[PDB]
Design an enzyme around this catalytic site. Structure first.
Site, PDB file in Angstrom:
ATOM      1  N   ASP A  83      12.670  42.998  36.244  1.00 42.32           N
ATOM      2  CA  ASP A  83      13.073  43.213  34.864  1.00 42.32           C
ATOM      3  C   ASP A  83      14.499  43.708  34.889  1.00 42.32           C
ATOM      4  O   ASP A  83      14.761  44.806  35.338  1.00 42.32           O
ATOM      5  CB  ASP A  83      12.185  44.281  34.227  1.00 42.32           C
ATOM      6  CG  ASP A  83      12.377  44.378  32.736  1.00 42.32           C
ATOM      7  OD1 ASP A  83      13.437  43.992  32.195  1.00 42.32           O
ATOM      8  OD2 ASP A  83      11.418  44.832  32.081  1.00 42.32           O
ATOM      9  N   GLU A  86      16.691  44.177  28.635  1.00 35.93           N
ATOM     10  CA  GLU A  86      16.773  43.334  27.452  1.00 35.93           C
ATOM     11  C   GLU A  86      15.943  42.086  27.571  1.00 35.93           C
ATOM     12  O   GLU A  86      16.364  41.014  27.175  1.00 35.93           O
ATOM     13  CB  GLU A  86      18.226  42.969  27.110  1.00 35.93           C
ATOM     14  CG  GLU A  86      19.082  44.129  26.645  1.00 35.93           C
ATOM     15  CD  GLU A  86      18.608  44.803  25.359  1.00 35.93           C
ATOM     16  OE1 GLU A  86      17.768  44.244  24.614  1.00 35.93           O
ATOM     17  OE2 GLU A  86      19.103  45.915  25.088  1.00 35.93           O
ATOM     18  N   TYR A 169      54.917  26.466  32.691  1.00 35.94           N
ATOM     19  CA  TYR A 169      55.200  25.307  33.517  1.00 35.94           C
ATOM     20  C   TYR A 169      53.890  24.706  33.971  1.00 35.94           C
ATOM     21  O   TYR A 169      52.836  25.301  33.850  1.00 35.94           O
ATOM     22  CB  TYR A 169      55.946  25.721  34.763  1.00 35.94           C
ATOM     23  CG  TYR A 169      55.216  26.819  35.386  1.00 35.94           C
ATOM     24  CD1 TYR A 169      54.186  26.590  36.251  1.00 35.94           C
ATOM     25  CD2 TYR A 169      55.460  28.087  35.005  1.00 35.94           C
ATOM     26  CE1 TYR A 169      53.458  27.625  36.750  1.00 35.94           C
ATOM     27  CE2 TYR A 169      54.747  29.127  35.499  1.00 35.94           C
ATOM     28  CZ  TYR A 169      53.759  28.891  36.379  1.00 35.94           C
ATOM     29  OH  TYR A 169      53.070  29.954  36.858  1.00 35.94           O
ATOM     30  N   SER A 182      44.166  36.236  39.067  1.00 39.74           N
ATOM     31  CA  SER A 182      45.236  36.236  38.096  1.00 39.74           C
ATOM     32  C   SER A 182      46.208  35.120  38.352  1.00 39.74           C
ATOM     33  O   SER A 182      47.122  34.937  37.579  1.00 39.74           O
ATOM     34  CB  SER A 182      45.976  37.568  38.126  1.00 39.74           C
ATOM     35  OG  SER A 182      46.705  37.796  39.297  1.00 39.74           O
ATOM     36  N   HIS A 187      52.082  29.415  48.571  1.00 38.83           N
ATOM     37  CA  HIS A 187      52.156  27.930  48.552  1.00 38.83           C
ATOM     38  C   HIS A 187      53.480  27.380  49.009  1.00 38.83           C
ATOM     39  O   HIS A 187      54.446  28.096  49.144  1.00 38.83           O
ATOM     40  CB  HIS A 187      51.788  27.378  47.177  1.00 38.83           C
ATOM     41  CG  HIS A 187      52.799  27.636  46.130  1.00 38.83           C
ATOM     42  ND1 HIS A 187      53.970  26.918  46.009  1.00 38.83           N
ATOM     43  CD2 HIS A 187      52.797  28.525  45.113  1.00 38.83           C
ATOM     44  CE1 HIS A 187      54.654  27.367  44.979  1.00 38.83           C
ATOM     45  NE2 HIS A 187      53.956  28.332  44.405  1.00 38.83           N
ATOM     46  N   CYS A 205      53.855  34.072  42.644  1.00 40.20           N
ATOM     47  CA  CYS A 205      53.411  33.539  43.881  1.00 40.20           C
ATOM     48  C   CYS A 205      54.305  33.920  45.045  1.00 40.20           C
ATOM     49  O   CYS A 205      55.455  34.266  44.860  1.00 40.20           O
ATOM     50  CB  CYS A 205      53.340  32.036  43.799  1.00 40.20           C
ATOM     51  SG  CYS A 205      52.086  31.417  42.659  1.00 40.20           S
TER      52      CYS A 205
END
Length: 259
Positions: A83, A86, A169, A182, A187, A205
């Site tokens: 349980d 709710e 962009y 976020s 990269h 980044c």
């Protein structure tokens, strides 16, 4: 009125020293305490850990310090018929057994503008980097490595900024490793190789050379750690999704099962 849990990491995976156990539910959990009591985690070697909820549908478990390499973790989510408040009940049980691989910690230092990767404490790569520009800086702190992408369309709107707004962009990028929900990625940035090691030009980044980005994609894995230091930014939020280690242990351990 039934809720299915999903557990990560996946069964049989080898993950880095920063990887928390995550249990996600497909419905808000009203009774967090009941969920926590249904989840049994075993470690070998044994280490203390604790639960902390990142949001209403996801709970995380981790130790005070990064995992020790070689640790084996067994997770039994024994939610069948529990349980969960709710009127919702656990639909089933789930499980995972995974292990912790080598200690891989990459540090991005804004004072040197070099991302250094250590494996089991020894330097194996040094990469010049270009982090977030002053108006969109990279936050300091501890980031857990998430998913990786050979190619992605990095779109500012995904992360709240309209593409067609003055600061948005939509760009194709290669060899992207995600380090925050976020939207922070390591990269490939072929246009800024000149700036790498000298000037911060990104939207947050960690931009590095094509070969260095491919190396990162290949050698840094889910659960490994990236620490950012000395930027003009604040600190990454602890409830980012990959920012768990920025919640101090005393707060983490106390939990939030009534919140």
């Amino acid at each position: 009125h039934l809720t299915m849990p999903y557990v990560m990491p996946g069964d049989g995976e080898v993950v880095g020293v920063g990887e928390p156990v995550a249990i996600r539910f497909d419905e808000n959990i009203a009774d967090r305490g009941a969920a926590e009591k249904a989840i049994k985690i075993t470690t070998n070697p044994p280490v203390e850990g604790a639960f902390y909820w990142l949001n209403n549908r996801e709970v995380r478990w981790r130790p005070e310090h990064f995992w020790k390499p070689g640790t084996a973790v067994d997770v039994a989510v024994n939610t069948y018929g529990v349980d969960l408040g709710e009127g919702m009940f656990g639909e089933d049980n789930v499980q995972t057994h995974f292990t912790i691989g080598d200690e891989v910690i990459a540090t991005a230092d804004d004072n040197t503008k070099i991302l250094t990767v250590r494996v089991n404490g020894e330097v194996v790569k040094s990469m010049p980097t270009s982090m977030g520009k002053d108006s969109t800086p990279t936050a300091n702190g501890i980031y857990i490595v998430g998913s990786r992408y050979k190619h992605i369309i990095m779109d500012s709107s995904t992360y709240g900024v309209p593409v067609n707004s003055p600061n948005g962009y939509r760009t194709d990028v290669d060899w992207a490793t995600q380090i925050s929900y976020s939207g922070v990625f390591v990269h490939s940035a072929p246009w800024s190789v000149g700036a790498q090691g000298h000037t911060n030009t990104s939207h947050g980044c960690l931009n590095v050379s094509p070969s260095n980005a491919q190396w990162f994609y290949d050698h840094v894995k889910r659960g490994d750690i990236v620490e950012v230091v000395n930027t003009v930014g604040g600190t990454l939020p602890g409830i980012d999704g990959l920012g768990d280690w920025n919640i101090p242990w005393d707060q983490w351990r106390a939990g939030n099962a009534k919140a």
